[PDB]
Amino acid sequence: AIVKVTDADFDSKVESGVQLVDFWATWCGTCKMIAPVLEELAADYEGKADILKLDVDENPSTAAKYEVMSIPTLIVFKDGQPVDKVVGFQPKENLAEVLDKHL
């Protein structure tokens, strides 16, 4: 469902189309709370968008590159460029809304 991404293959996986990247960490309670919401969302958009996860403790440079200061942070990418951002907890509805705005 949700594919992991790291500093090493980020540019490889985020280059074409629309991707939603979830910047999370194991110590993040709110991040665990949105995880199930993204797994559903991912299904709702198979073939439309890719949902990726990037652990900020193990991949500090990508987090620094996109100014990710607080988590969770979800960033929408389109053809390798960040076009939108969502912070904090968000119900499935609100996330689907942000995606259709870029498809």
Swiss-Prot record:
Domain Thioredoxin: 1-103
Family in the record: Belongs to the thioredoxin family.
Record Gene3D superfamilies: Glutaredoxin (3.40.30.10)
Gene Ontology, cellular component aspect: cytosol
Protein species of origin: Staphylococcus aureus
Source organism, top-level taxon: Bacteria
Induction context: Expressed in both aerobic and anaerobic conditions.
Annotated protein name in UniProt: Thioredoxin
Disulfide-bonded cysteines: C28-C31
Gene Ontology BP, a term: cell redox homeostasis
Record NCBIfam families: thioredoxin (TIGR01068)
